[PDB]
Amino acid sequence: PNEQQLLFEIKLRSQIVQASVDLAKSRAQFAIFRFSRCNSQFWLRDERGGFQLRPDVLPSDAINDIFVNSELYAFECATAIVIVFYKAVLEGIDVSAFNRLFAHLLLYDWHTDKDLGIETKKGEHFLPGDCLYFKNPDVDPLTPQWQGENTIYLGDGLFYGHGIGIETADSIIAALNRRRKATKSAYLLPHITQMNFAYLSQFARLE
C-alpha cells in the first residue's frame, strides 16, 4: 500500500459516512424496483427500475440532485448503497474525472456497478464506510422487501439502512426478525463490500 492511497482511503471513508448521514436525513423514500422513482430532469427509469443517466446531463449534477431534489426519488436499500458511494467519490475526486469516468452511469445495485470496482470479501473487521448485509433468512413471503438490509457502517456501533434509518445492529436485526415466517434470526453476513480505493485514489483532488 502506497502512502497516498492509504490516506485517500481513510479520507474517503469519512465522505462515505457524511453521504450516508445526508441521504438518511433527506426526503428520499424507500421503494421496490417495480415502483422506483427519480427526477426526470436527470434520470430515465429503465425496464428493470434502475435509474439511467440521461445523455445530456452531467454525472456530477445528477448524483448531487438525488440529495437536492431527494423528494423526487424512491429506491431500494441496495440502490442507496451505490448512491452514497458515488456521492462520496464525487466529494473526493476531481469533478472533471468524475464526469468523464461515470458518463453513462446506471444505478441499480452494487452488483451491476462497474465504474467503482466494488467487490465483496469474507471478513468481520469492517470499518466505517463499509457496506454490510443483514440477512433475514426466514423472511415473510408476503413481504419479500425484508429478505435483508444493505447498510453502511458509520462508526459508534451505528449503521445506515435506507428505509430504516441510523440504527445499531441490534435494532436492525430486531426490526427484520418479525417480518418473518420461525427458527433463524436475522444475522450479519461475515462479508465486507467496498469500492476499490487504490484504483480511485489516482483521481483524488489536490488539497
Could you tell me the CA-to-CA distances from 152 to 16, 18, 19, 165 in Å, in that order? 8, 11, 10, 11
109 with 125, same domain? no
60 with 142, same domain? no
Find all residues with CB under 8 Å of 39, minimum gap 6, and list them: 65, 66, 69, 72, 73
151 with 78, same domain? no
Query: 171 in a domain, yes or no?
Result: yes
d(CA 158, CA 9): 20
CA 86 to chain CA centroid, nearest Å: 8
CA 18 to chain CA centroid, nearest Å: 12
157 with 69, same domain? no
The CB density around residue 51, as the number of other CB atoms within 10 Å, is: 25
d(CA 151, CA 135): 11
* Range of the structural domain that residue 164 is part of: 120-192
Query: Residue 69 has which C-alpha cell?
Result: 431534489
39 with 107, same domain? yes
11 with 98, same domain? yes
Query: 97 in a domain, yes or no?
Result: yes
- Residue 204 DSSP label: B
Query: 48 in a domain, yes or no?
Result: yes
CA dihedral of residues 16, 20, 22, 28 (deg, nearest 10): 140
144 in Cβ contact with 78 (< 8 Å): no
The maximal CA–CA distance of the chain, rounded, in angstroms, is 54
Strands 74-75 and 29-30: what pairing?
A: parallel
Q: What's the reported resolution, in angstroms, to a tenth?
A: 2.1
> Which is nearest to 154 in space by CA: 9, 18, 11?
18
Find all residues with CB under 8 Å of 54, minimum gap 6, and list them: 41, 42, 43, 44, 62
Residue corresponding to grid cell 475526486: 93
104 with 150, same domain? no
d(CA 12, CA 84): 11
d(CA 96, CA 129): 24
- Residue 69 DSSP label: S
Query: 154 in a domain, yes or no?
Result: yes
Domain stop point among 71, 91, 116: 116
Query: Residue 149 has which C-alpha cell?
Result: 438490509
Query: 162 in a domain, yes or no?
Result: yes
Find all residues with CB under 8 Å of 172, minimum gap 6, and list them: 134, 149, 151, 159, 161, 164, 186
Could you tell me the CA-to-CA distances from 26 to 3, 40, 71, 97, 177 in Å, in that order? 35, 18, 8, 27, 26
Query: 203 in a domain, yes or no?
Result: no
d(CA 198, CA 56): 30
172 in Cβ contact with 148 (< 8 Å): no
- What kind and span of H or E run contains 40? none
Query: 75 in a domain, yes or no?
Result: yes
Query: 150 in a domain, yes or no?
Result: yes
Q: Which residues of 113-124 are buried (b: 16+ CB within 10 A; e: fewer)?
A: bebbebeeeeee
166 in Cβ contact with 158 (< 8 Å): yes
- Residue 203 DSSP label: G
d(CA 201, CA 24): 26
Backbone angles phi, psi at 144, to 5 degrees: -70, -5
Domain stop point among 88, 116, 144: 116
140 with 109, same domain? no
71 with 128, same domain? no
Experimental method: X-ray
48 with 12, same domain? yes
The tally of domains found in the chain comes to 2
Domain stop point among 93, 116, 139: 116
> Which is nearest to 86 in space by CA: 195, 204, 199?
195
91 with 156, same domain? no
Query: Residue 168 has which C-alpha cell?
Result: 445499531
178 with 92, same domain? no
d(CA 99, CA 103): 6
